Structure formats: C-alpha cells, structure tokens
C-alpha cells in the first residue's frame, strides 16, 4: 500500500463475529475457502516471484521539489522574465490545488460509501471540510476565465479585499 491514512483516512472496520443459528452449511464459506485454495494461492505465489525479481532489480525515483521564486506581487510590470517565473509558479500551484480538490472529493465519496444509511450524520466533518475548501477555491480561482493567470488572480484578490475593506468601514 503506497498510500497513507494521514491523507486518506479510514475508520477501523468493526466486523461482527459469525453466530450461525441454522444447521445448514454456509455456501459462502465453502466457496471462499475453495476460492482461496484455487485462486489466491497461485496468484500470491506469482506475485511473490515478481516481488523478489524486483528486489533483485531494485531502482529508486524521487519527487521533484521547486524552490519558491519571487511572487508576481514583487514583479515589475513589463518585466517578462520574473513575470514568466511567477506565472509558471502560479500554474504549478493551480495544478496542485486541482489535485487537492480531487483528494477532498474522493475522501467525501469514501465517507458517503462507508457510512451508507448514516451519511447525513456521520459525514458532517467531511462535508464541512469539503465546504470550506470549496469556498476557499471559489475565493481564489473562480470566474478567472479560460486565460487564467497570476495577474488575473491577483486582480480578483485585490477586488475582493477592497470590497471587504469597504464593508469593514461600516
């Protein structure tokens, strides 16, 4: 499992013990035992062989990290070099925010499927997280247009802060 429960939380399963009142045999138990002995054993054998071959030929890869270039707020207008660097950084952060929204939505869907009939009560914190991140995403990225850019995002943020400051006057 390459994933972690810090970013994909999952409550621990609570399965009940079997309490068979009837004297009839369980065909599900018979079929699961037969299915294990017929299918799961050769599959785990060939997977162990593949894993030991990978251990024989083990390689590593890394996750690239970008240093923080100066923001567009300190870039002079008409200076296309620093403007280009800030625009590329903004597009990178935009893609990261898209994947953050994907993570939150997937977490919410997992909560809904796990709870089932109790999703209106037990997914309150997941829905709250989804609502808060949706509101923040709408505040930073909505209505930018097809030609979205760091300049347009900055102009939208300046307009929103001006409206908030004018509302805070009274």
Partner 1 sequence: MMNGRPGHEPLKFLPDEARSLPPPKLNDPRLVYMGLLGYCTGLMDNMLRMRPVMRAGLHRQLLFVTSFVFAGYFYLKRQNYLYAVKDHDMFGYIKLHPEDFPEKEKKTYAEILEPFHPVR
> Which positions touch partner 1 (CB under 8 A)?
72-79, 142-146, 151-152, 154-156, 158-159
CB of 10 to partner 1, least distance (A): 38
CB of 145 to partner 1, least distance (A): 3
Instruction: Give how far the C-alpha of residue 47 lies from the chain's centroid of Cα atoms, to the nearest Å.
Output: 28
CB of 77 to partner 1, least distance (A): 5
CB of 119 or CB of 141, closer to partner 1: 141
What is the DSSP secondary structure assignment for residue 77, as one 8-state letter?
T
Residue 165's nearest CA partner among 152, 134, 157, 71 is 157
147 CB neighbour count, 10 Å cutoff:
7
How far is residue 19 from each of residues 24, 26, 53, measured CA to CA in Å? 13, 12, 44
CB of 4 or CB of 74, closer to partner 1: 74
CB of 101 or CB of 154, closer to partner 1: 154
């Amino acid at each position: 499992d390459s994933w972690d429960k810090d970013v994909y939380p999952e409550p621990p399963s609570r399965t009940p013990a079997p309490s068979p009142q009837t004297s009839l045999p369980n065909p599900i138990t018979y079929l699961t035992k037969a299915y294990d002995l017929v299918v799961d054993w050769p599959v785990t054998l060939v997977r162990e062989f593949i894993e030991r071959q990978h251990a024989k030929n083990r390689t590593y890869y890394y996750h690239r990290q970008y240093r923080r270039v100066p923001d567009i707020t300190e870039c002079k207008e008409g200076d296309v070099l620093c403007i280009y660097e800030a625009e590329m950084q903004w597009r990178r952060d935009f893609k990261v925010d898209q994947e953050i929204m994907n993570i939150i939505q997937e977490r919410l869907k997992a909560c809904q499927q796990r709870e089932g009939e109790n999703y209106q009560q037990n997914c309150a914190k997941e829905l709250e997280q989804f609502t808060k991140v949706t509101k923040a995403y709408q505040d930073r990225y909505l209505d930018l247009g097809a030609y979205y850019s760091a300049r347009k995002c900055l102009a939208k943020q300046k307009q929103r802060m001006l409206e908030e400051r004018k509302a805070a006057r009274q």
